[PDB]
Amino acid sequence: GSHMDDANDIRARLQTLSERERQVLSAVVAGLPNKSIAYDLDISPRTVEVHRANVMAKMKAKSLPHLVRMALAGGFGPS
């Protein structure tokens, strides 16, 4: 239980995390700029910088790829 874990476990986790997670993640899932993201989730880029780094840090992620990967790995993949 150090990094990543199962597929659906991630999803259910993607939410248990917090708005900051479901927020930046759903923006990160695509790969848009820190600005469009922060604003895409009614917030500032300085926030996503905090949230994001937190999100991947608390969600058990590792990097941008890992996050989204864990995002799509479950159900956080924008078709």
Curated annotation (Swiss-Prot):
Cell location:
Cytoplasm
List residues of the HTH luxR-type domain: 10-75
Tell me where the transmembrane regions lie.
none
Q: How would you describe the post-translational modification of this protein?
A: Phosphorylated by FixL.
Q: Which residues bind DNA?
A: 34-53
Report the protein's function.
FixJ, when activated by FixL, induces the expression of both nifA, required for activation of classical nif and fix genes, and fixK, required for FixN activation.
Q: What is this protein called?
A: Transcriptional regulatory protein FixJ
- Supply the source organism's classification: Bacteria, Pseudomonadati, Pseudomonadota, Alphaproteobacteria, Hyphomicrobiales
Whole sequence portion shown: 130 to 204 of 204
